Design a protein around this ligand. Structure first.
Ligand SMILES: CO[C@@](NC(=O)Cc1cccs1)(C(=O)O)[C@@H]1N=C(C(=O)O)[C@@H](COC(N)=O)CS1
Ligand SMILES: CO[C@@](NC(=O)Cc1cccs1)(C(=O)O)[C@@H]1N=C(C(=O)O)[C@@H](COC(N)=O)CS1
Ligand SMILES: CO[C@@](NC(=O)Cc1cccs1)(C(=O)O)[C@@H]1N=C(C(=O)O)[C@@H](COC(N)=O)CS1
Ligand SMILES: CO[C@@](NC(=O)Cc1cccs1)(C(=O)O)[C@@H]1N=C(C(=O)O)[C@@H](COC(N)=O)CS1
Ligand SMILES: [Zn+2]
Ligand SMILES: [Zn+2]
Ligand SMILES: [Zn+2]
Ligand SMILES: [Zn+2]
Ligand SMILES: [Zn+2]
Ligand SMILES: [Zn+2]
Ligand SMILES: [Zn+2]
Ligand SMILES: [Zn+2]
Lengths: 265, 265, 265, 265
């Protein structure tokens, strides 16, 4: 009986379904797939990308940037929600093919640098090409590109380095406070007494309160379904979107249910 | 007028004054210098080192390990209070010359990997040979060597990755709960509105409470003077040592004074 | 039409077929699978592993080490032929689970550190968990463990960092010069005018001459079939093995044929 | 007697003496100090920097780039002769303060990543802030920026990763083949039987022949004195410059003398 073959990280087809750029605000666009967020923020001083989705999405992202008028040299900065294969997958390749540098917190930087291997919960089951961070950010630190100010809000739990990124764009004339809040799921995680993450529960609890309080005229999430976006719905893609408060509440009620099921299991 | 010469990181002579091993408990020894802590914990399954002091202390540390019966192959694990040059200085060289692997949190790992460069407060003024961590630890995570259980307690502030390490040794027959608590100083730091560390004050405040609550029959600190140890005093080196509560209180009162002076300056 | 799913690196079943340890010489054992080499050299001062095969072979390797009397703490050193997924696959995990440190040349170290991603020929098609080298070796440099002396012989081509490792064991009473020569294949490679490897042909040519001249009483190769070993054949596993000269000649004739086919294609 | 204080890497004042930009060709400028080369190549598609000199030269380099019309965002690429503190010193800081990415061979990348520590000859005596390479180049590989084509020519010896960089600029109307050849010195090195560099002599010998053969209308070197440039001499700074052949011959005769002195010592 031979050892098992390596199993590829396969995902729902919608996660891999290319879409054209979808405008969120005056300078903010969804340029990923139908079910994975990849946000492009275009400034007079270069472009910012928040997440890239899966590893095989690099060329599609570059195609959509070109459609927006962003050449490789114009991409200056990559920010991440968290460093799992379905959100940071193409970062290494994007750095090779563009001018982009990566800013992340220390936890996300060390997970990115090992390509998602030795994951606290998934082991080596969900890996991707490693990449190095060019700048380490602290909680509450701001990064400014072309006068758009991005603020990091750590929300540890889904990964230790999970981060919400907030910035203010404009929509019609008016300012719109965008919150790109990270996943709050704990899929198959051991929550209680986890030796690799002893304070997991306390961190999730604190992260629910962080998300509740974000400046949040428009919430986006790495899996759009988590915040009730439908990127395939065109003009009403965002119509049903949750508030940050509703997203946090829904995630906490699910988390409490999982805790109770874990105690029973 | 030429640019200034590089300035070496020079320190008080006592920080560089070798001492023979000084026993703290049945399996725990101070093996550094008179004014820099480097703790050796000897187990039937290999030795653990907590800090190494300055970069030029590597050979002295190895000499003192040999005096204790610890060969290079026997050193299994290096733990750190924080990754500044005066505490992690010789880690790279020790890894090259021994069997030792490094365990640290993500923040300390990324500062160690850049040799203390791009420090949040010191810039490139205080650097040392970079080293890689072999294992990343989470807050409250335990590491066990030869049946001595080391628990990490994050106490961010002096550096983002500052850590207290606790373990239980024996003294005479009886269990002794040793707390190796990190520095709580903020020397020359900008405390309020620091763009590189926006939550600095809140982190220090939380770290005072962490130190206050450590299991703490005997407190040790990276600078022994901070906890009123006198390593040159032989049998009463530890006689005047502070409790963790007194160490935390003294550090918080100093911190409050610095905050007030900063507001006035 | 969604983007393609990630494709796993799947291999012939024999590459994943566990085997019990097979003795090559007094202190040298094949402990990998039927069709992937992983050599254990046991010394009174700890064990050396040369290659680990595929990423999923880590537990099997540890099982075979235990069968040989080598505990995790006893594994001191991992050496590599080259840093592709089918030979260095489990190195990251072995470092986490054992005392082992990795020694490699700079080229192999940088490919290992990126988990085989951005391969000169395979791109991101054949990746694995990244690992860091603890020691960088130069061509002709020796490493000594328990009095067995390992010499590195660079043989760039299959990868830039491809290395032959030689050492002298004993067999019956007599010294046996073992050559663990790396692959000399160029599978699907663009050989001529390759912008990522401009001197590829000259390096292969030099590497054929390096292999021809190795001290070589017994040749082993990462794919045993390349040197006509049959690890499933028991007492005559090595009976048909090639000399280093015959291995080099066969690889050069194949290489010349590929060059001619490339010119015609 | 305390252990010695750390000794700073101090250098001749002329190495630290700022100079205004000095034009070498239509798009190539010396922008370092009087006695350390730092070459800026300006293209319509961004700027390239070849070396930065000492760690404290970062702000001066940025000042001279601004004088040339190169903003931080416009610096796209840093190339290196070799990764010692007096040539790669400010690379980490330049990467933090500019858009620049680093391309280097594997040997230079691993020495840069450890900030010049664990040097084959200097140990930890000559270190600097570590930096990561963004692209690894092979011997003979070309990199193109704004239509200037840079070719790497490995010339191992002074360091394992020592590299000559060649490109063609224009001067008046006519093409000028510029060779930025690395140091060929071996200052205080053990040349024969060096366990950390067993093939040192053969590598130097091959590197003399590489330099002899470079396309070389104008030779520049990291220490301008090595090629008889005088950056303080204005219009005749380059008047006395050596050919690549004369530079190689002078370095080989010095090397042969050192070998003979080493045999006698
Ligand atoms: C590595 O990626 C994830 N796992 C998998 O893909 C596959 C799985 C492994 C173990 C349980 S599931 C993960 O991080 O668990 C995805 N990302 C998520 C997020 O919250 O970021 C969740 C999204 O929730 C749904 N059903 O859409 C679960 S799927
Ligand atoms: C980099 O090392 C430290 N700085 C210096 O050496 C030198 C300095 C730079 C800026 C202000 S001072 C640092 O971290 O600030 C030492 N370590 C300490 C700790 O708390 O770990 C403090 C100990 O307090 C005293 N007076 O003994 C201050 S000295
Ligand atoms: C990444 O691993 C290898 N590729 C594959 O597995 C699968 C392939 C990708 C592209 C062509 S094939 C590689 O390096 O090309 C294996 N290792 C080899 C060595 O020489 O090390 C060769 C062994 O030759 C045979 N037929 O046994 C080819 S298979
Ligand atoms: C680390 O830098 C160098 N060492 C020192 O600075 C100081 C020294 C340490 C040991 C011997 S000297 C080095 O690499 O040896 C400089 N760079 C050089 C090059 O060739 O790049 C040489 C230039 O020759 C002269 N006299 O100008 C020697 S000085
Ligand atoms: Zn995830
Ligand atoms: Zn996800
Ligand atoms: Zn400190
Ligand atoms: Zn200190
Ligand atoms: Zn291979
Ligand atoms: Zn192979
Ligand atoms: Zn040098
Ligand atoms: Zn030099």
């Amino acid at each position: 009986v031979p050892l098992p073959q390596l199993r590829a990280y396969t995902v729902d087809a919608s996660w891999l379904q290319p879409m054209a750029p979808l405008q969120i605000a005056d300078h903010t666009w969804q340029i990923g797939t139908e079910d994975l967020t990849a946000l492009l923020v275009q400034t007079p001083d270069g472009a910012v990308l928040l997440d890239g989705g899966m590893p095989q999405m690099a060329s599609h992202l570059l195609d959509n940037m070109k459609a927006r008028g962003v050449t490789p040299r114009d991409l200056r900065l990559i920010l991440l929600s968290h460093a799992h294969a379905d959100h940071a997958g193409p970062v290494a390749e994007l750095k090779r093919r563009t001018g982009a540098k990566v800013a992340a917190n220390a936890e996300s930087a060390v997970l990115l640098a090992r390509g998602g291997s030795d994951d606290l919960h998934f082991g080596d089951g969900i890996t991707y090409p490693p990449a190095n961070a060019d700048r380490i950010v602290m909680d509450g630190e701001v990064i400014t590109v072309g006068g758009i100010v991005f603020t990091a809000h750590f929300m540890a739990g889904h990964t230790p380095g999970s981060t919400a990124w907030t910035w203010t764009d404009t929509r019609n004339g008016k300012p719109v406070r965008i919150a790109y809040a990270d996943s709050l799921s704990a899929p198959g995680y051991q929550l209680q007494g986890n030796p690799r993450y002893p304070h997991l529960i306390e961190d999730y609890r604190r992260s629910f309160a962080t998300v509740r309080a974000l400046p949040c005229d428009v919430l986006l999430t790495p899996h759009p379904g988590a915040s009730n976006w439908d990127y395939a719905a065109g003009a009403r893609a965002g119509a049903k979107a949750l508030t940050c408060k509703a997203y946090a509440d829904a995630a906490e009620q699910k988390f409490d249910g999982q805790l109770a099921k874990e105690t029973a299991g």
